[PDB]
Structures are given as C-alpha cells and as structure tokens.
Design an enzyme around this catalytic site. Structure first.
Site, PDB file in Angstrom:
ATOM      1  N   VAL A  52       0.825  -1.193   0.000  1.00 51.77           N
ATOM      2  CA  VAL A  52       0.000   0.000   0.000  1.00 51.77           C
ATOM      3  C   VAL A  52       0.864   1.250   0.000  1.00 51.77           C
ATOM      4  O   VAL A  52       0.513   2.268  -0.591  1.00 51.77           O
ATOM      5  CB  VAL A  52      -0.914  -0.004   1.246  1.00 51.77           C
ATOM      6  N   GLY A  53       2.015   1.167   0.673  1.00 58.71           N
ATOM      7  CA  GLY A  53       2.896   2.321   0.749  1.00 58.71           C
ATOM      8  C   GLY A  53       4.277   2.000   1.271  1.00 58.71           C
ATOM      9  O   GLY A  53       4.531   0.965   1.884  1.00 58.71           O
ATOM     10  N   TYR A 108      10.949   4.735   6.267  1.00 61.43           N
ATOM     11  CA  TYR A 108      10.364   4.219   7.490  1.00 61.43           C
ATOM     12  C   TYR A 108      10.209   2.706   7.511  1.00 61.43           C
ATOM     13  O   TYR A 108      10.331   2.045   8.540  1.00 61.43           O
ATOM     14  CB  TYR A 108       8.974   4.847   7.711  1.00 61.43           C
ATOM     15  N   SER A 121       7.524  -0.348   5.377  1.00 63.58           N
ATOM     16  CA  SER A 121       6.473  -0.541   4.379  1.00 63.58           C
ATOM     17  C   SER A 121       5.171  -0.963   5.043  1.00 63.58           C
ATOM     18  O   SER A 121       5.241  -1.571   6.114  1.00 63.58           O
ATOM     19  CB  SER A 121       6.901  -1.606   3.371  1.00 63.58           C
ATOM     20  N   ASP A 173       1.062   9.309  12.600  1.00 62.50           N
ATOM     21  CA  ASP A 173       2.439   9.755  12.773  1.00 62.50           C
ATOM     22  C   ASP A 173       2.673  10.869  13.791  1.00 62.50           C
ATOM     23  O   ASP A 173       3.642  11.634  13.663  1.00 62.50           O
ATOM     24  CB  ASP A 173       2.958  10.217  11.394  1.00 62.50           C
TER      25      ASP A 173
END
Ligand SMILES: C[C@H](Nc1nccc(-c2c(-c3ccc(F)cc3)c(=O)n(C3CCNCC3)n2C)n1)c1ccccc1
EC number: 2.7.11.24
Length: 338
Positions: free
Chosen positions: A26-27, A31, A33, A163
């Site tokens: 998805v992204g 950081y 995944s 976040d």
C-alpha cells in the site's frame, strides 16, 4: 505464539502470523512498508506496517520504542491506535523485526469527495482533527508535523490522525512559524497552526502558503497575517530573527473575509483565531471545538482526554540493546483491545 508464513513483497520480505491474509503493498519509503491485509480472526481489514531497520542504530532503536509506546497508548476514534503488534522473533536474542497492526483506512487527505470539498465536509473533517488533537494534546504529546498526508480517512469521511509525536502536501507548508524558524520554545498550538493551513486548503482548493523555502514561506505567511507588532516582537529572543523581520517593511494584516471571500463566515472567524503568529494567543484544540462553526458536531460530553502518558524515556540516553529490550518487553506485554 501463532504460526507465521514468509513471503516477499515489493522486494520486501514479510513474516507474519497466519491470521493475516492477502498482504498487498500500500505504501513505503524510508520508514519501512505497509500492506493492506485481511484479518481472518476478526473479519476486519487491517494495515500491517513492518518497521524498516528498527534497531540499526541508537536513534532507530529509540524511535522504534517511541513509536510502539505512542501507539500502544492512544485509544481514540480520531487517532490511529494498535490492534496488534508482533515479531517473528521467538526470543530477545533473535528479535530484529517489528510489525504494527491497525485498522485499514482508505486514503489520506491529499487524495480524498468534491473538488469543492463543501463546507459541511470541511466542518466534519476539521472537527475530527480537533477532537483527535484534543486527546493527543491532553497527554502532553504534540504532533509537530501535522499535514494532509498524515490524516487518514474513510469513504465515510471518518478521520484518523497518523504519525503524531514522531517528529521529535509539503511539510514546511503546514508548519507553525515558531518551530519553523528554530524555536525550542513553542507549545501544542503549533498543531493548531497546521490545522489552520489544512482547513484553508480544503475550503479553497489551493495550498495557503506554498513557499519554496523557509524564507519564502515566512514571507508568504506575513503577507496574510502581517508583520509581528512590537507586542509579539518582545518575545523573539534572537536578534537574528528579530533583525530580519524588523528589516522588512511592515506588512498589514489582511481581512481574512476578503481572502477566503465567500466561505462560511464562521469558517473565516475560526481561521482567524488559528492563524495567529503569537503562539500564546492562538486558539487551542479544546477551545476550537467549542467555536460555533462546529455547533452541529460539537459534544462536550464526547470529546475525551487521554490517560497520562509517560515520556520519561525521552530524556534517556541508552545503548541499542537497552532500547531493543525495552521494545521487546512492550511487544510481550501488549494487550489487544476488547
Ligand atoms: C492504504 C493505507 N492504509 C493505511 N491504513 C492505516 C494506517 C496506514 C499507515 C500506517 C500505519 C500502519 C499500521 C500501523 F500499525 C500504524 C500506522 C503508516 O505508518 N502510514 C504511513 C504514514 C506516513 N509515514 C509513512 C507510513 N500509513 C499510511 N495506512 C494508506 C496509504 C496511504 C495513505 C493513507 C492510507
């Protein structure tokens, strides 16, 4: 312990328990995944985040611990929280990977309804951000990098903040001038500035203060809010800052009513109270939730605060193996929600 299965995704291997099916990237980036997954044990769809290199350094290891502690703490409808946290690791000694699980959200605020967002959509979305911020700020946590790509939403316009407390479209665009031009001293209303910027954008279709760098950015902001008067200029320590600002001729403060022209006048007044330079005079999340623009959503009986959150770890200077074992302990004590 459950049964895991391994698999490589986007050149990223994943070793997760059986309960999670149909992993689908998805992204990703630095950081780590995220995969959308289906959780067979509860029928619900989730997001699984594998941290990138959780213990590669002291800073990595501390940030990993920081993120896990933050996530285990947040229990609120408008704040991402923890469904599950797991590791393939069967012991402290093997521990080297961390996976975090939360409910899957549809998209972020960059790309989600109308081109013209509609004032009631605006009301609901900003209401939810302020209600989440209220909770977060109540635990003495500050976002610091609030912006549309950190706001997750559903097709139903349900919203969650992402976040938060980690920063211990463009970021700079939504940042409060006091932390932007380096200030160790500001307060949680830095996040209200960002709310201001986001709200303006939604209502308007364009980024309020685009800005190609910190200088252009501050220039764009003074154009709307006007140069600092002597009242605020009294609180700027650095000759540095004070000389530049005093160096530019005064810009008057504009009539917001004319900038956001034909927006709901209630919207504009709220914008006026959020987009104030003096962080002492800036409205807080709990106060904003009581402004009239949210009369349709505001409910003082249902805008809860957080239990106290211990960030004493934050001033701690430890070795990677101490942070790593701190993290392992938090995995092992994790209690899923009821
Ligand atoms: C489809 C995906 N769905 C989703 N759902 C829930 C949480 C998430 C999610 C998480 C996330 C996932 C699991 C957790 F346990 C905690 C957080 C996460 O860390 N991000 C990015 C935030 C910005 N920094 C990079 C990581 N996103 C997008 N993603 C998504 C992708 C992009 C934007 C919004 C939502």
């Amino acid at each position: 312990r459950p049964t895991f299965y391994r698999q490589e995704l986007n050149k990223t291997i994943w070793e997760v328990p059986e309960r999670y099916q149909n992993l689908s990237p998805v992204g990703s980036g630095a950081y780590g995944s995220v995969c959308a997954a289906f959780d067979t044990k509860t029928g619900h769809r989730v997001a699984v985040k594998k941290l990138s290199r959780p213990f590669q350094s002291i800073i990595h290891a501390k940030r990993t611990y920081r993120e896990l502690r933050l996530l285990k703490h947040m229990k609120h409808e408008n704040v991402i929280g923890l469904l599950d946290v797991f590791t393939p690791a069967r012991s402290l000694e093997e521990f080297n990977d961390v996976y975090l699980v939360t409910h899957l959200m549809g998209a972020d605020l960059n790309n989600i309804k109308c081109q013209k967002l509609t004032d009631d959509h605006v009301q609901f979305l900003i209401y939810q951000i302020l209600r989440g911020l209220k909770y977060i700020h109540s635990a003495d946590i500050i976002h610091r990098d609030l912006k549309p790509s950190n706001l997750a939403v559903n097709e139903d316009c349900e919203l969650k903040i992402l976040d938060f407390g980690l920063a211990r479209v463009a970021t700079r665009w939504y940042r409060a001038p006091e932390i932007m031009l380096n200030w160790m001293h500001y307060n949680q209303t830095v996040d209200i500035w960002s709310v201001g910027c986001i709200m303006a954008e939604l209502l308007t279709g364009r980024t309020l203060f685009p800005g190609t760098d910190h200088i252009d950015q501050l220039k764009l902001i003074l154009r709307l809010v006007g140069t600092p008067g002597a009242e605020l200029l009294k609180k700027i320590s650095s000759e540095s800052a004070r000389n530049y600002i005093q160096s530019l001729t005064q810009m008057p403060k504009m009539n917001f009513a004319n900038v956001f022209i034909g927006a709901n006048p209630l919207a504009v007044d709220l914008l006026e109270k959020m987009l104030v330079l003096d962080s002492d005079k800036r409205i807080t999340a709990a106060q904003a939730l009581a402004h009239a623009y949210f009369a349709q959503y505001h409910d003082p009986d249902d805008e809860p605060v957080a239990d106290p959150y211990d960030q004493s770890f934050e001033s701690r200077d430890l070795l990677i193996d101490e942070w790593k074992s701190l993290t392992y302990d938090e995995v092992i004590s994790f209690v899923p929600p009821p």
